[PDB]
Design an enzyme around this catalytic site. Structure first.
Site, PDB file in Angstrom:
ATOM      1  N   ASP A  42       0.810  -1.218   0.000  1.00  0.00           N
ATOM      2  CA  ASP A  42       0.000   0.000   0.000  1.00  0.00           C
ATOM      3  C   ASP A  42       0.842   1.267   0.000  1.00  0.00           C
ATOM      4  O   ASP A  42       0.508   2.244  -0.674  1.00  0.00           O
ATOM      5  CB  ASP A  42      -0.985   0.001   1.179  1.00  0.00           C
ATOM      6  CG  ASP A  42      -2.217  -0.902   0.932  1.00  0.00           C
ATOM      7  OD1 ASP A  42      -2.309  -1.553  -0.138  1.00  0.00           O
ATOM      8  OD2 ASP A  42      -3.100  -0.948   1.819  1.00  0.00           O
ATOM      9  N   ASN A  82      -4.450  -2.313  -4.496  1.00  0.00           N
ATOM     10  CA  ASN A  82      -5.779  -2.353  -3.882  1.00  0.00           C
ATOM     11  C   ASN A  82      -5.702  -1.488  -2.630  1.00  0.00           C
ATOM     12  O   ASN A  82      -6.337  -1.767  -1.606  1.00  0.00           O
ATOM     13  CB  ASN A  82      -6.194  -3.793  -3.538  1.00  0.00           C
ATOM     14  CG  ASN A  82      -7.685  -3.906  -3.213  1.00  0.00           C
ATOM     15  OD1 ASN A  82      -8.462  -3.003  -3.513  1.00  0.00           O
ATOM     16  ND2 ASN A  82      -8.087  -5.030  -2.627  1.00  0.00           N
ATOM     17  N   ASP A 132     -11.079  -3.120  11.175  1.00  0.00           N
ATOM     18  CA  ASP A 132      -9.951  -3.944  10.740  1.00  0.00           C
ATOM     19  C   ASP A 132      -9.487  -4.882  11.836  1.00  0.00           C
ATOM     20  O   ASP A 132      -9.420  -6.098  11.639  1.00  0.00           O
ATOM     21  CB  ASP A 132      -8.786  -3.070  10.306  1.00  0.00           C
ATOM     22  CG  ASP A 132      -9.072  -2.284   9.042  1.00  0.00           C
ATOM     23  OD1 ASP A 132      -8.178  -1.530   8.641  1.00  0.00           O
ATOM     24  OD2 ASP A 132     -10.170  -2.414   8.450  1.00  0.00           O
ATOM     25  N   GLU A 152     -10.845  -5.434   1.082  1.00  0.00           N
ATOM     26  CA  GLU A 152      -9.977  -6.268   0.254  1.00  0.00           C
ATOM     27  C   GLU A 152     -10.695  -7.420  -0.423  1.00  0.00           C
ATOM     28  O   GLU A 152     -10.323  -7.844  -1.518  1.00  0.00           O
ATOM     29  CB  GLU A 152      -8.770  -6.764   1.059  1.00  0.00           C
ATOM     30  CG  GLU A 152      -7.691  -5.665   1.252  1.00  0.00           C
ATOM     31  CD  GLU A 152      -7.955  -4.691   2.408  1.00  0.00           C
ATOM     32  OE1 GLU A 152      -9.121  -4.530   2.867  1.00  0.00           O
ATOM     33  OE2 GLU A 152      -6.968  -4.061   2.839  1.00  0.00           O
ATOM     34  N   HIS A 167      -4.648  -9.617   3.016  1.00  0.00           N
ATOM     35  CA  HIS A 167      -3.638  -9.737   4.071  1.00  0.00           C
ATOM     36  C   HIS A 167      -4.234 -10.151   5.412  1.00  0.00           C
ATOM     37  O   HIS A 167      -3.656 -11.005   6.099  1.00  0.00           O
ATOM     38  CB  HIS A 167      -2.882  -8.404   4.238  1.00  0.00           C
ATOM     39  CG  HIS A 167      -3.774  -7.216   4.466  1.00  0.00           C
ATOM     40  ND1 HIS A 167      -3.463  -6.227   5.371  1.00  0.00           N
ATOM     41  CD2 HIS A 167      -4.931  -6.827   3.873  1.00  0.00           C
ATOM     42  CE1 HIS A 167      -4.384  -5.276   5.327  1.00  0.00           C
ATOM     43  NE2 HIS A 167      -5.287  -5.615   4.425  1.00  0.00           N
ATOM     44  N   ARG A 168      -5.392  -9.599   5.785  1.00  0.00           N
ATOM     45  CA  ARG A 168      -5.932  -9.940   7.090  1.00  0.00           C
ATOM     46  C   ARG A 168      -6.518 -11.334   7.207  1.00  0.00           C
ATOM     47  O   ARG A 168      -6.588 -11.878   8.305  1.00  0.00           O
ATOM     48  CB  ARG A 168      -6.929  -8.872   7.564  1.00  0.00           C
ATOM     49  CG  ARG A 168      -6.259  -7.487   7.681  1.00  0.00           C
ATOM     50  CD  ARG A 168      -6.942  -6.551   8.704  1.00  0.00           C
ATOM     51  NE  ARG A 168      -6.367  -5.220   8.496  1.00  0.00           N
ATOM     52  CZ  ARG A 168      -5.157  -4.835   8.887  1.00  0.00           C
ATOM     53  NH1 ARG A 168      -4.391  -5.626   9.644  1.00  0.00           N
ATOM     54  NH2 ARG A 168      -4.741  -3.600   8.568  1.00  0.00           N
ATOM     55  N   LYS A 184       0.459  -6.657   1.761  1.00  0.00           N
ATOM     56  CA  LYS A 184      -0.304  -5.419   1.580  1.00  0.00           C
ATOM     57  C   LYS A 184       0.039  -4.430   2.702  1.00  0.00           C
ATOM     58  O   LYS A 184       0.194  -3.224   2.461  1.00  0.00           O
ATOM     59  CB  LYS A 184      -1.819  -5.662   1.583  1.00  0.00           C
ATOM     60  CG  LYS A 184      -2.606  -4.450   1.068  1.00  0.00           C
ATOM     61  CD  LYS A 184      -4.067  -4.822   0.784  1.00  0.00           C
ATOM     62  CE  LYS A 184      -4.821  -3.670   0.125  1.00  0.00           C
ATOM     63  NZ  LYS A 184      -5.199  -2.616   1.121  1.00  0.00           N
TER      64      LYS A 184
HETATM   65  O1  S3P Z   1      -8.475   5.935   6.747  1.00  0.00           O
HETATM   66  C1  S3P Z   1      -7.787   4.892   6.827  1.00  0.00           C
HETATM   67  O2  S3P Z   1      -6.578   4.870   7.005  1.00  0.00           O
HETATM   68  C2  S3P Z   1      -8.504   3.565   6.818  1.00  0.00           C
HETATM   69  C3  S3P Z   1      -9.893   3.555   7.087  1.00  0.00           C
HETATM   70  C4  S3P Z   1     -10.686   2.266   7.084  1.00  0.00           C
HETATM   71  O3  S3P Z   1     -11.612   2.221   5.901  1.00  0.00           O
HETATM   72  P1  S3P Z   1     -13.294   2.544   5.957  1.00  0.00           P
HETATM   73  O4  S3P Z   1     -13.501   3.953   6.346  1.00  0.00           O
HETATM   74  O5  S3P Z   1     -13.822   2.305   4.608  1.00  0.00           O
HETATM   75  O6  S3P Z   1     -13.870   1.612   6.988  1.00  0.00           O
HETATM   76  C5  S3P Z   1      -9.771   1.026   7.222  1.00  0.00           C
HETATM   77  O7  S3P Z   1     -10.567  -0.146   7.016  1.00  0.00           O
HETATM   78  C6  S3P Z   1      -8.565   1.090   6.268  1.00  0.00           C
HETATM   79  O8  S3P Z   1      -7.732  -0.058   6.452  1.00  0.00           O
HETATM   80  C7  S3P Z   1      -7.763   2.360   6.577  1.00  0.00           C
HETATM   81  O1  GPF Z   2      -6.390  -2.808   6.010  1.00  0.00           O
HETATM   82  C1  GPF Z   2      -7.573  -3.295   6.093  1.00  0.00           C
HETATM   83  O2  GPF Z   2      -7.914  -4.175   6.885  1.00  0.00           O
HETATM   84  C2  GPF Z   2      -8.650  -2.763   5.160  1.00  0.00           C
HETATM   85  N1  GPF Z   2      -8.092  -1.754   4.271  1.00  0.00           N
HETATM   86  C3  GPF Z   2      -8.909  -1.203   3.204  1.00  0.00           C
HETATM   87  P1  GPF Z   2      -8.037  -0.015   2.296  1.00  0.00           P
HETATM   88  O3  GPF Z   2      -7.431  -0.710   1.089  1.00  0.00           O
HETATM   89  O4  GPF Z   2      -6.946   0.521   3.159  1.00  0.00           O
HETATM   90  O5  GPF Z   2      -9.098   0.973   1.927  1.00  0.00           O
END
Ligand code: S3P
Ligand code: GPF
Length: 427
Positions: free
Chosen positions: A49, A94, A313, A341, A385-386, A411
């Site tokens: 990422d 992604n 998460d 994901e 990844h999770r 990721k």
């Molecule tokens: O702002 C961020 O850093 C993130 C917000 C979350 O997404 P959502 O707002 O769609 O839940 C999370 O799931 C992602 O891994 C990171």
């Molecule tokens: O990290 C996680 O569990 C979910 N992440 C979604 P993102 O690709 O960061 O919008």
């Protein structure tokens, strides 16, 4: 198909120095790129990422250098909105926190840029953000399916009154918040209804302030932003350790410790996922807080029934930890697991059943009744990844577990398995 088989782990105990936070890393890189001056980021995360964000910055002409381990980055700020023309294509894997923020930021001024990614990214929604950006003046075109990437951005976001739906992703609001200060006119962002993943909005505001910008937050229902601002380098900035990555190790102790200490995050962290520790405490584990660490010591483990919208998460880690808890666990208000994901409610329910659990896959919740004993399973990971990290916990039982495509952990946490091994003890 690559796979990794984890042998039963008798006990876990030790200390893990956490990899950098993905959420903080990508926000810090984008803001450093937009800012005036040179920013030095330390403890930056090296994962897919972040690599996609770094590659995007390189393609947009931003100059920076990375240390040998890719955790120290010296960024030369652009002193304003980033630009490129010719429908320059930026591939973002992604990475939602690269895709959403860049989709907004690159709407500033004129540009002709295309944002795309892996197949799954073309199935993750972005319409709520595009709708908001357009209300602000942006010209955005869906090149494939309406409401999803890829997007062709041709600029024009000037500010004004912008409504945004916050019911599916907080990332849309985050993207607007980081972009608006640099718009020529003032912007009033009005949240339409509910706001999910609220703690991430606090991470965004925290980073913006570090980079010199503050806005008026009216109880998270409306945000008033003054335009014509400029981000400024904070000098040297330490990226917090990843609290979501920490969940696996703390949960491992809750299940099979021992005491596991994670360093790089502490009681003062801005990440909402440090609240994951409170859930383990509610389940029966013992938690210790420090200025630069959080530790968990085995106590007991009882099922819980909780709204997990504030830690979506890290909440996945409770789903597999539930396999070891007494009673039926229910995780609620996690609809957006379906748009990440992979559809995580379908995936988690499917794989949990493979190791013996009885699972109700609710529309926006999951109910897990553990089996008397787990059985071996080859776990599918859905390019997530999770899923790989959550199911690694199955090995804290008397049965091994085979994890398909283990490198998908890259990721956000390339070294996950070596780190889990570090705290895995035979005695
Ligand atoms: O702002 C961020 O850093 C993130 C917000 C979350 O997404 P959502 O707002 O769609 O839940 C999370 O799931 C992602 O891994 C990171
Ligand atoms: O990290 C996680 O569990 C979910 N992440 C979604 P993102 O690709 O960061 O919008």
């Amino acid at each position: 198909m690559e796979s990794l088989t984890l042998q039963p782990i008798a006990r876990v105990d030790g200390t893990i120095n956490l990899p950098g936070s993905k959420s903080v890393s990508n926000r810090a890189l984008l803001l450093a790129a937009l800012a005036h001056g040179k920013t030095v980021l330390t403890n930056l995360l090296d994962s897919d990422d972040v690599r996609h964000m770094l590659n995007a910055l390189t393609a947009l002409g931003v100059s920076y250098t990375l240390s040998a381990d890719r955790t120290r980055c010296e960024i030369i700020g652009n002193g304003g909105p980033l630009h490129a023309e010719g429908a320059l294509e930026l591939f973002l894997g992604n990475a939602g926190i690269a895709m959403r923020p860049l989709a907004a930021a690159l709407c500033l001024g004129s540009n002709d840029i295309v944002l795309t990614g892996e197949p799954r990214m073309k199935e993750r929604p972005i319409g709520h953000l595009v709708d908001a950006l357009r209300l602000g003046g942006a010209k955005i075109t869906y090149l494939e399916q309406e409401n999803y990437p890829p997007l062709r951005l041709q600029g024009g976001f000037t500010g004004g009154n912008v409504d945004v739906d916050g019911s599916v992703s907080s990332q849309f609001l985050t993207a607007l918040l980081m972009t608006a200060p640099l718009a020529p006119e003032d912007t009033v962002i009005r949240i339409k209804g509910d706001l999910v993943s609220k703690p991430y909005i606090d991470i965004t505001l925290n980073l913006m302030k570090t980079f010199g910008v503050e806005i008026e937050n009216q109880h998270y229902q409306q945000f008033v932003v003054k335009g014509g601002q400029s981000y400024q380098s904070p000098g040297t900035y330490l990226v917090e350790g990843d609290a979501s990555s920490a969940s696996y190790f703390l949960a491992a102790a809750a299940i099979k410790g021992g005491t596991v200490k994670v360093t790089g995050i502490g009681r003062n962290s801005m990440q909402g996922d440090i609240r994951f520790a409170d859930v383990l405490e509610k389940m029966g584990a013992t938690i210790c807080w420090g200025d630069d660490y959080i530790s968990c010591t085995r106590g007991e483990l009882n099922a819980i029934d909780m709204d997990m919208n504030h830690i979506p998460d890290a909440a996945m880690t409770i789903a597999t930890a539930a396999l070891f808890a007494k009673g039926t666990t229910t995780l609620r208000n996690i609809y957006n697991w379906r748009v990440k994901e992979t559809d995580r409610l379908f995936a988690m329910a499917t794989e949990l059943r493979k190791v013996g659990a009885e699972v109700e896959e609710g529309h926006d919740y999951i109910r897990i009744t553990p089996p008397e004993k787990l059985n071996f399973a080859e776990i599918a990971t859905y390019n997530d990844h999770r899923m790989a990290m959550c199911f690694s916990l199955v090995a804290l039982s008397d049965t091994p577990v085979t994890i398909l495509d283990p490198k998908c952990t890259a990721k956000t946490f390339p070294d996950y398995f070596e780190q889990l091994a570090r705290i895995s003890q035979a005695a």
